[PDB]
Motif scaffolding. Structure first.
Motif, PDB file in Angstrom:
ATOM      1  N   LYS A 113       0.810  -1.211   0.000  1.00  0.00           N
ATOM      2  CA  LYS A 113       0.000   0.000   0.000  1.00  0.00           C
ATOM      3  C   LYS A 113       0.849   1.269   0.000  1.00  0.00           C
ATOM      4  N   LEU A 114       0.291   2.333  -0.571  1.00  0.00           N
ATOM      5  CA  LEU A 114       0.948   3.635  -0.654  1.00  0.00           C
ATOM      6  C   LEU A 114       0.382   4.511   0.465  1.00  0.00           C
ATOM      7  N   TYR A 115       1.252   5.165   1.229  1.00  0.00           N
ATOM      8  CA  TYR A 115       0.788   5.994   2.340  1.00  0.00           C
ATOM      9  C   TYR A 115       1.133   7.476   2.235  1.00  0.00           C
ATOM     10  N   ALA A 116       1.926   7.846   1.237  1.00  0.00           N
ATOM     11  CA  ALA A 116       2.308   9.243   1.072  1.00  0.00           C
ATOM     12  C   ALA A 116       2.952   9.435  -0.283  1.00  0.00           C
ATOM     13  N   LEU A 117       3.118  10.692  -0.685  1.00  0.00           N
ATOM     14  CA  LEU A 117       3.760  11.025  -1.961  1.00  0.00           C
ATOM     15  C   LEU A 117       4.854  12.056  -1.711  1.00  0.00           C
ATOM     16  N   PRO A 118       5.940  11.984  -2.490  1.00  0.00           N
ATOM     17  CA  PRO A 118       7.047  12.931  -2.313  1.00  0.00           C
ATOM     18  C   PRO A 118       6.761  14.327  -2.846  1.00  0.00           C
ATOM     19  N   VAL A 119       6.816  15.335  -1.977  1.00  0.00           N
ATOM     20  CA  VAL A 119       6.592  16.717  -2.416  1.00  0.00           C
ATOM     21  C   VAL A 119       7.909  17.174  -3.029  1.00  0.00           C
ATOM     22  N   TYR A 120       8.998  16.925  -2.308  1.00  0.00           N
ATOM     23  CA  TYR A 120      10.324  17.220  -2.829  1.00  0.00           C
ATOM     24  C   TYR A 120      11.346  16.239  -2.274  1.00  0.00           C
ATOM     25  N   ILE A 121      12.393  16.019  -3.057  1.00  0.00           N
ATOM     26  CA  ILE A 121      13.458  15.094  -2.706  1.00  0.00           C
ATOM     27  C   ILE A 121      14.736  15.898  -2.475  1.00  0.00           C
ATOM     28  N   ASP A 122      15.123  16.023  -1.207  1.00  0.00           N
ATOM     29  CA  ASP A 122      16.325  16.766  -0.835  1.00  0.00           C
ATOM     30  C   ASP A 122      17.567  15.885  -0.903  1.00  0.00           C
ATOM     31  N   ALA A 123      18.702  16.514  -1.184  1.00  0.00           N
ATOM     32  CA  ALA A 123      19.982  15.830  -1.236  1.00  0.00           C
ATOM     33  C   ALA A 123      20.997  16.887  -0.827  1.00  0.00           C
ATOM     34  N   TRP A 294      10.438  16.061   2.039  1.00  0.00           N
ATOM     35  CA  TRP A 294       9.163  15.959   2.710  1.00  0.00           C
ATOM     36  C   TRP A 294       8.084  15.351   1.839  1.00  0.00           C
ATOM     37  N   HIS A 295       7.288  14.496   2.468  1.00  0.00           N
ATOM     38  CA  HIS A 295       6.219  13.790   1.795  1.00  0.00           C
ATOM     39  C   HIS A 295       4.873  14.176   2.379  1.00  0.00           C
ATOM     40  N   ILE A 296       3.859  14.191   1.525  1.00  0.00           N
ATOM     41  CA  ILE A 296       2.529  14.573   1.955  1.00  0.00           C
ATOM     42  C   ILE A 296       1.641  13.349   2.201  1.00  0.00           C
ATOM     43  N   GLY A 297       0.902  13.393   3.306  1.00  0.00           N
ATOM     44  CA  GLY A 297       0.025  12.295   3.669  1.00  0.00           C
ATOM     45  C   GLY A 297      -1.282  12.760   4.286  1.00  0.00           C
ATOM     46  N   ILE A 298      -2.237  11.843   4.383  1.00  0.00           N
ATOM     47  CA  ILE A 298      -3.547  12.144   4.939  1.00  0.00           C
ATOM     48  C   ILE A 298      -3.781  11.397   6.250  1.00  0.00           C
ATOM     49  N   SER A 299      -4.283  12.119   7.242  1.00  0.00           N
ATOM     50  CA  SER A 299      -4.558  11.537   8.552  1.00  0.00           C
ATOM     51  C   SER A 299      -5.667  10.495   8.489  1.00  0.00           C
ATOM     52  N   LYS A 300      -5.443   9.361   9.146  1.00  0.00           N
ATOM     53  CA  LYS A 300      -6.431   8.286   9.200  1.00  0.00           C
ATOM     54  C   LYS A 300      -7.676   8.784   9.917  1.00  0.00           C
ATOM     55  N   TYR A 301      -7.497   9.806  10.750  1.00  0.00           N
ATOM     56  CA  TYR A 301      -8.577  10.381  11.550  1.00  0.00           C
ATOM     57  C   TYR A 301      -9.303  11.558  10.906  1.00  0.00           C
ATOM     58  N   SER A 302      -8.948  11.873   9.666  1.00  0.00           N
ATOM     59  CA  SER A 302      -9.583  12.984   8.968  1.00  0.00           C
ATOM     60  C   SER A 302     -11.048  12.706   8.648  1.00  0.00           C
ATOM     61  N   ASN A 327      10.815  28.693  -8.038  1.00  0.00           N
ATOM     62  CA  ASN A 327      10.832  29.682  -6.965  1.00  0.00           C
ATOM     63  C   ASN A 327      11.600  29.336  -5.696  1.00  0.00           C
ATOM     64  N   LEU A 328      11.421  28.119  -5.194  1.00  0.00           N
ATOM     65  CA  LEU A 328      12.084  27.723  -3.958  1.00  0.00           C
ATOM     66  C   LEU A 328      13.375  26.952  -4.179  1.00  0.00           C
ATOM     67  N   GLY A 329      13.572  26.467  -5.401  1.00  0.00           N
ATOM     68  CA  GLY A 329      14.777  25.717  -5.708  1.00  0.00           C
ATOM     69  C   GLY A 329      14.671  24.248  -5.337  1.00  0.00           C
ATOM     70  N   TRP A 330      13.500  23.829  -4.866  1.00  0.00           N
ATOM     71  CA  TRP A 330      13.298  22.441  -4.475  1.00  0.00           C
ATOM     72  C   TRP A 330      13.452  21.479  -5.642  1.00  0.00           C
ATOM     73  N   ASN A 331      13.962  20.282  -5.346  1.00  0.00           N
ATOM     74  CA  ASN A 331      14.082  19.225  -6.345  1.00  0.00           C
ATOM     75  C   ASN A 331      12.740  18.483  -6.219  1.00  0.00           C
ATOM     76  N   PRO A 332      11.872  18.605  -7.233  1.00  0.00           N
ATOM     77  CA  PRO A 332      10.546  17.983  -7.265  1.00  0.00           C
ATOM     78  C   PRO A 332      10.423  16.485  -7.060  1.00  0.00           C
ATOM     79  N   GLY A 333       9.289  16.091  -6.490  1.00  0.00           N
ATOM     80  CA  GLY A 333       8.995  14.686  -6.284  1.00  0.00           C
ATOM     81  C   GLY A 333       8.406  14.136  -7.577  1.00  0.00           C
ATOM     82  N   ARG A 334       8.000  15.037  -8.473  1.00  0.00           N
ATOM     83  CA  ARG A 334       7.432  14.664  -9.770  1.00  0.00           C
ATOM     84  C   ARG A 334       8.529  14.726 -10.844  1.00  0.00           C
ATOM     85  N   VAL A 335       8.635  13.678 -11.646  1.00  0.00           N
ATOM     86  CA  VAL A 335       9.654  13.609 -12.683  1.00  0.00           C
ATOM     87  C   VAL A 335       9.489  14.643 -13.800  1.00  0.00           C
TER      88      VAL A 335
END
Ligand SMILES: OC[C@H]1O[C@H](O[C@H]2O[C@H](CO)[C@@H](O)[C@H](O)[C@H]2O)[C@H](O)[C@@H](O)[C@@H]1O
Ligand SMILES: [Cl-]
Ligand SMILES: [Cl-]
Ligand SMILES: [Cl-]
Ligand SMILES: [Cl-]
Ligand SMILES: [Cl-]
Ligand SMILES: [Pt+2]
Ligand SMILES: [Pt+2]
Ligand SMILES: [Pt+2]
Length: 407
Positions: A113-123, A294-302, A327-335
């Protein structure tokens, strides 16, 4: 406040939080009958973690959606606080191939199962004053740590003639999570390792000779070569380091992708004078960069999971991701976003240093990382302070890690 409302808990550097406000505004503009309330958090990753677990352990529906550090995302999955995304992906026929599968495979999935998605991938990245290297006769950034020290000292000595606050190299050494990330880079770039998996369980190897040697170099940057300030181990974290470099008081800086966005801001004294390169390595080994993000997720209690998912899709959307990179210089979680002409124009290193991001070294991916990290922080910081030797530090850490792994 129980129909079409959702509270999004997020933190980060001050500028990132302000950017998120704009993201929320754009979201509500595109989805007219919905409300997204911002729940502001700090920059410190542990404080962000605490803010979340405190709400979640109390089965509070308050934070509906939120960001989790890739470092402790496993803890939230194991604790069962996250709503599986599979159903939502299925219903919208959402395409998951648009994200970097490596990070997903490594931290976002469990039990199929998938529980979250990558907003950005830091290195981890090496930021340097291109103008200063040029001024002191250096045509390219350093490939080895020894070369960085050489350049750093020559530039430091020269700049101190008029700048007593100038330091050749600033990085995160305070006793917190950020120190573990810096440490990991020196360790692996010397052929070291924090441990490996055996029979499906992580086994610590904190005190390997290569590790001790790496920690010794870190100590020397402060006490022997003196190109890193004494407060490196007492106060230096992401922002203090980023500010010091932007102020023009450092030739080299180790930091995450977000620093670029700020350094290239029109309010920045170093704008147009900053280069980005892979962090150096010790001879005979390869450059290392700690995997973060950082990855984005949804609370089971939502009580508004459907709305939360709509927000998740927006944050992971091409346009929003493109704005993060530009704008922020983040390395995207989306290819592919890193390849967008608008993104290459403002953040060319996302494309040029592609290998850095794709080969980022993960900290031990285990449900009890928080407790393991605490052990590494204490001893590594103690060694940086000169309170104990690198050897004694890693041997001591090794002992506690073993006890911890023993559950
Ligand atoms: O975007 C910058 C973020 O930096 C933190 O995140 C990085 O540093 C952490 C250690 O300090 C890592 O654990 C994490 O994986 C890295 O991405 C800071 O905690 C966040 O608030 C900032 O937004
Ligand atoms: Cl000393
Ligand atoms: Cl000193
Ligand atoms: Cl723009
Ligand atoms: Cl752009
Ligand atoms: Cl632009
Ligand atoms: Pt010293
Ligand atoms: Pt400063
Ligand atoms: Pt732009």
């Amino acid at each position: 406040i129980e129909e079409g409302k959702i509270v999004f808990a997020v933190g980060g550097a001050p500028n990132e939080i302000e950017y998120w406000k704009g993201v929320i505004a754009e979201f509500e503009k595109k989805y007219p009958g919905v409300t997204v309330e911002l729940k502001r958090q700090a920059t410190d990753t542990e404080q962000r973690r605490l803010d979340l677990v405190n709400a979640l352990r109390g089965k509070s529906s308050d934070p509906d959606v939120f960001l989790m550090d890739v470092a402790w995302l496993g803890q939230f999955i194991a604790s069962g606080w996250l709503e599986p995304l599979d159903d939502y992906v299925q219903k919208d026929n959402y395409d998951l191939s648009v994200f970097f599968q490596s990070v997903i495979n490594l931290a976002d999935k469990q039990g199929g199962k998938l529980y979250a998605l990558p907003v950005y991938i830091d290195a981890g990245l090496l930021y340097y004053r291109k103008d200063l290297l040029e001024k002191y006769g250096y045509s390219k950034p350093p490939e080895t740590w020894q070369e960085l020290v050489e350049m750093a000292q020559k530039i430091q000595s020269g700049e101190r003639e008029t700048n007593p606050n100038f330091w050749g190299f600033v990085w995160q050494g305070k006793q917190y999570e950020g120190l573990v990330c810096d440490f990991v880079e020196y360790v692996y770039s010397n052929g070291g390792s924090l441990g490996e998996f055996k029979d499906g369980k992580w086994v610590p190897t904190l005190n390997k000779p290569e590790n001790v040697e790496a920690l010794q170099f870190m100590v020397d940057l402060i006490h022997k070569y003196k190109i890193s300030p004494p407060n490196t181990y007492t106060e230096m974290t992401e922002e203090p380091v980023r500010l010091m470099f932007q102020q023009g008081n450092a030739a080299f800086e180790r930091n995450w992708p977000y620093a670029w966005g700020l350094h290239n801001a029109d309010d920045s004294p170093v704008k147009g004078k900053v280069g980005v390169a892979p962090l150096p390595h010790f001879p005979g080994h390869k450059s290392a960069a700690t995997l973060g993000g950082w990855h984005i997720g949804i609370s089971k209690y939502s009580d508004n999971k459907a709305l939360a998912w709509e927000f998740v899709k927006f944050v992971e959307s091409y346009s929003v991701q493109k704005g993060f990179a530009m704008n922020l210089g983040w390395n995207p979680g989306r290819v592919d976003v890193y390849d967008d002409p608008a993104v290459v124009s403002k953040s060319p290193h996302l494309k040029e240093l592609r290998a850095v991001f794709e080969n980022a070294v993960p900290r031990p991916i285990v449900p009890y990382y928080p407790q393991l990290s605490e052990i590494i922080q204490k001893y590594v910081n103690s060694a940086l302070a000169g309170k104990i030797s690198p050897q004694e530090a890693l041997d001591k850490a090794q002992k506690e890690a073993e006890e911890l792994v023993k559950q």
